[PDB]
Design an enzyme around this catalytic site. Sequence first.
Site, PDB file in Angstrom:
ATOM      1  N   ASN A  76      35.100  38.342  57.337  1.00  0.00           N
ATOM      2  CA  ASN A  76      35.181  39.189  58.524  1.00  0.00           C
ATOM      3  C   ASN A  76      33.806  39.688  58.969  1.00  0.00           C
ATOM      4  O   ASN A  76      33.707  40.768  59.525  1.00  0.00           O
ATOM      5  CB  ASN A  76      36.089  40.391  58.186  1.00  0.00           C
ATOM      6  CG  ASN A  76      36.477  41.219  59.402  1.00  0.00           C
ATOM      7  OD1 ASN A  76      36.986  40.691  60.387  1.00  0.00           O
ATOM      8  ND2 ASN A  76      36.262  42.533  59.324  1.00  0.00           N
ATOM      9  N   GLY A  78      31.358  37.739  60.884  1.00  0.00           N
ATOM     10  CA  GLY A  78      30.675  36.967  61.898  1.00  0.00           C
ATOM     11  C   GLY A  78      30.703  37.583  63.282  1.00  0.00           C
ATOM     12  O   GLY A  78      31.378  38.579  63.534  1.00  0.00           O
ATOM     13  N   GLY A 184      25.376  33.287  57.039  1.00  0.00           N
ATOM     14  CA  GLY A 184      26.485  32.340  57.014  1.00  0.00           C
ATOM     15  C   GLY A 184      27.521  32.779  55.992  1.00  0.00           C
ATOM     16  O   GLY A 184      27.209  33.605  55.114  1.00  0.00           O
ATOM     17  N   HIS A 185      28.762  32.286  56.106  1.00  0.00           N
ATOM     18  CA  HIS A 185      29.788  32.751  55.138  1.00  0.00           C
ATOM     19  C   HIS A 185      29.485  32.246  53.726  1.00  0.00           C
ATOM     20  O   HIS A 185      30.014  32.751  52.746  1.00  0.00           O
ATOM     21  CB  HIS A 185      31.233  32.408  55.545  1.00  0.00           C
ATOM     22  CG  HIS A 185      31.375  31.033  56.212  1.00  0.00           C
ATOM     23  ND1 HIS A 185      31.237  29.847  55.530  1.00  0.00           N
ATOM     24  CD2 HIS A 185      31.607  30.706  57.500  1.00  0.00           C
ATOM     25  CE1 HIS A 185      31.383  28.839  56.370  1.00  0.00           C
ATOM     26  NE2 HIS A 185      31.610  29.334  57.574  1.00  0.00           N
ATOM     27  N   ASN A 213      39.276  32.108  56.562  1.00  0.00           N
ATOM     28  CA  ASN A 213      38.645  32.756  57.713  1.00  0.00           C
ATOM     29  C   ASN A 213      39.468  33.890  58.263  1.00  0.00           C
ATOM     30  O   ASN A 213      40.699  33.853  58.216  1.00  0.00           O
ATOM     31  CB  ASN A 213      38.428  31.773  58.846  1.00  0.00           C
ATOM     32  CG  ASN A 213      37.573  30.619  58.449  1.00  0.00           C
ATOM     33  OD1 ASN A 213      36.655  30.754  57.626  1.00  0.00           O
ATOM     34  ND2 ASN A 213      37.848  29.467  59.041  1.00  0.00           N
ATOM     35  N   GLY A 214      38.783  34.887  58.809  1.00  0.00           N
ATOM     36  CA  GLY A 214      39.478  36.020  59.393  1.00  0.00           C
ATOM     37  C   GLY A 214      40.302  35.639  60.624  1.00  0.00           C
ATOM     38  O   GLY A 214      41.248  36.345  60.958  1.00  0.00           O
ATOM     39  N   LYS A 374      38.515  29.681  67.363  1.00  0.00           N
ATOM     40  CA  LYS A 374      37.057  29.590  67.533  1.00  0.00           C
ATOM     41  C   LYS A 374      36.629  29.819  68.988  1.00  0.00           C
ATOM     42  O   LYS A 374      35.481  30.172  69.256  1.00  0.00           O
ATOM     43  CB  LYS A 374      36.534  28.207  67.117  1.00  0.00           C
ATOM     44  CG  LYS A 374      36.969  27.764  65.741  1.00  0.00           C
ATOM     45  CD  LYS A 374      36.582  28.805  64.723  1.00  0.00           C
ATOM     46  CE  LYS A 374      37.342  28.611  63.441  1.00  0.00           C
ATOM     47  NZ  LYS A 374      36.993  29.658  62.449  1.00  0.00           N
TER      48      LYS A 374
HETATM   49  O1  UPG Z   1      27.646  35.098  58.192  1.00  0.00           O
HETATM   50  C1  UPG Z   1      28.836  35.026  58.444  1.00  0.00           C
HETATM   51  C2  UPG Z   1      29.417  34.012  59.362  1.00  0.00           C
HETATM   52  C3  UPG Z   1      30.776  33.949  59.500  1.00  0.00           C
HETATM   53  N1  UPG Z   1      31.654  34.820  58.824  1.00  0.00           N
HETATM   54  C4  UPG Z   1      33.136  34.740  58.992  1.00  0.00           C
HETATM   55  O2  UPG Z   1      33.582  33.548  58.311  1.00  0.00           O
HETATM   56  C5  UPG Z   1      34.435  32.779  59.194  1.00  0.00           C
HETATM   57  C6  UPG Z   1      33.504  31.639  59.724  1.00  0.00           C
HETATM   58  O3  UPG Z   1      34.024  30.955  60.764  1.00  0.00           O
HETATM   59  P1  UPG Z   1      33.432  30.651  62.172  1.00  0.00           P
HETATM   60  O4  UPG Z   1      32.022  30.951  62.367  1.00  0.00           O
HETATM   61  O5  UPG Z   1      34.429  31.123  63.131  1.00  0.00           O
HETATM   62  O6  UPG Z   1      33.517  29.120  61.976  1.00  0.00           O
HETATM   63  P2  UPG Z   1      32.604  27.980  61.339  1.00  0.00           P
HETATM   64  O7  UPG Z   1      31.625  28.512  60.419  1.00  0.00           O
HETATM   65  O8  UPG Z   1      32.055  27.229  62.488  1.00  0.00           O
HETATM   66  O9  UPG Z   1      33.549  27.033  60.451  1.00  0.00           O
HETATM   67  C7  UPG Z   1      34.344  27.338  59.307  1.00  0.00           C
HETATM   68  O10 UPG Z   1      35.749  27.241  59.615  1.00  0.00           O
HETATM   69  C8  UPG Z   1      36.151  25.905  60.098  1.00  0.00           C
HETATM   70  C9  UPG Z   1      37.662  25.997  60.208  1.00  0.00           C
HETATM   71  O11 UPG Z   1      37.848  26.838  61.341  1.00  0.00           O
HETATM   72  C10 UPG Z   1      35.789  24.815  59.062  1.00  0.00           C
HETATM   73  O12 UPG Z   1      36.145  23.541  59.637  1.00  0.00           O
HETATM   74  C11 UPG Z   1      34.280  24.867  58.743  1.00  0.00           C
HETATM   75  O13 UPG Z   1      33.932  23.880  57.757  1.00  0.00           O
HETATM   76  C12 UPG Z   1      33.956  26.310  58.249  1.00  0.00           C
HETATM   77  O14 UPG Z   1      32.576  26.431  57.953  1.00  0.00           O
HETATM   78  C13 UPG Z   1      34.902  33.815  60.209  1.00  0.00           C
HETATM   79  O15 UPG Z   1      36.028  34.588  59.707  1.00  0.00           O
HETATM   80  C14 UPG Z   1      33.697  34.725  60.425  1.00  0.00           C
HETATM   81  O16 UPG Z   1      33.924  36.001  60.997  1.00  0.00           O
HETATM   82  C15 UPG Z   1      31.135  35.874  58.001  1.00  0.00           C
HETATM   83  O17 UPG Z   1      31.873  36.655  57.422  1.00  0.00           O
HETATM   84  N2  UPG Z   1      29.763  35.895  57.890  1.00  0.00           N
END
Ligand code: UPG
Length: 482
Positions: A76, A78, A184-185, A213-214, A374
């Site tokens: 949560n 990003g 990054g996550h 993911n959130g 997304k």
């Molecule tokens: O520094 C960070 C960056 C992101 N997040 C969170 O982690 C998730 C990341 O997702 P998001 O940025 O929306 O998507 P991507 O990083 O582009 O992709 C992720 O999610 C996709 C599925 O939706 C997968 O296909 C990818 O491999 C995976 O990295 C979300 O809940 C964000 O809020 C954090 O907590 N911190």
Amino acid sequence: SLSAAAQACVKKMRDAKVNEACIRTFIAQHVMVSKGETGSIPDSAIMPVDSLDALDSLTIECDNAVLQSTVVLKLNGGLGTGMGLCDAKTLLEVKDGKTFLDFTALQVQYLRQHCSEHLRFMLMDSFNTSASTKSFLKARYPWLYQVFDSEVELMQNQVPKILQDTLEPAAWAENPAYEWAPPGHGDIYTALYGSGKLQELVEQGYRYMFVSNGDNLGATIDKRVLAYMEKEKIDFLMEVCRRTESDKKGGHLARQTVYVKGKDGQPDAEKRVLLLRESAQCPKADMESFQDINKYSFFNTNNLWIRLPVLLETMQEHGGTLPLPVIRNEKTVDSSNSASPKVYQLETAMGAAIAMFESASAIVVPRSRFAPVKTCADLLALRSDAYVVTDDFRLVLDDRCHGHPPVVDLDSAHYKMMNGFEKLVQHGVPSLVECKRVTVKGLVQFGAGNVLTGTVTIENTDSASAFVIPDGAKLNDTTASP
Ligand SMILES: O=c1ccn([C@@H]2O[C@H](COP(=O)(O)OP(=O)(O)O[C@H]3O[C@H](CO)[C@@H](O)[C@H](O)[C@H]3O)[C@@H](O)[C@H]2O)c(=O)[nH]1
């Protein structure tokens, strides 16, 4: 021995009291970058995955012990920059009066009333999303708020943006807070380790962690995955879905072949190793290959399972870090201002860990465990009747869809931003359950009771005037316009 630039980053991070684990992790990434590492994974270096077990074939559930040793964590921290968001995406509404955060909590609650009353639930927040999240829970789910600091929140780290030329940390006099960016996550492992939380969970008897993911509300714990992991002795498991047309932003699975010439007499034993390739890791000029959903049909849902003791030990043996492959993101110190200096923001993706454990693996799961958000286009789908609420409070595609979510395509000029998309559904969200594809070109506004079926395109070639669709309208395999 670090170059002056790297040493400057370390100094900046020490001064700012950045956790040592985060510094060690960031620096190893900085060393890579300084040597030419761009983060790209070329097509010639990887191969498709043709065979994975399927969650649908599993039936045995884990024992009480194993289930009790499982922690749940929701990412949560990003930014929803791409959707013009300024705060936690999870605070947006998904169904009338319910936010992502609402359904997440209901999910936790349900499991605490049925599976394990003391289920450990966590949220990784950034400082940008922390306060908003806490206050929401305080007003809506006090039972979570009261233990927010003690057991729920994992605060992600912050790393310095670095000048593209010299790799020195960038400075921004106007707003120094712009000198730091989330990592990054993939930072979850680092933050878990550095804060001492990873060690603490393992001391208290936790053995597994289910992360997702959130934005994905189709993901909750499945006791069959745990039993499978226990039995197959898997330390890391990535849930992947058969790639659809809608899976354009995220990452896909892939393999490489490693040769373990083990033993005397026995010959070359081939060993398949898996890895993740985010969109950002595909060489910009070879993107069509990343986009081909046939070549790479296994898309990461980011529904990951990790055996905590093993994660903790491999990080310990590796200098107190998880050497995930660096992703070199290019931006300007002040994202808004393009006159500001160019910088690299080093990040890692959580799923990349699949390459770090000998017994790591992936499993194909049904589409019901993956309802991504997304873009505003995805948000439209989630909001429409195409998605339904289950008893354990997950958002899953309607049965009529057959695991096929509506292919939504909204004009980036009017709907990419939440403010634009919000005026599109101002008068109601169109039924999309029976809709296979809906495109919207130009400025348009849905009316009430709008029902789409089959392939529907809505054109507003006119431009200067919002083409408002009538109430109760019904659009079947057509192209409606003024
Ligand atoms: O520094 C960070 C960056 C992101 N997040 C969170 O982690 C998730 C990341 O997702 P998001 O940025 O929306 O998507 P991507 O990083 O582009 O992709 C992720 O999610 C996709 C599925 O939706 C997968 O296909 C990818 O491999 C995976 O990295 C979300 O809940 C964000 O809020 C954090 O907590 N911190």
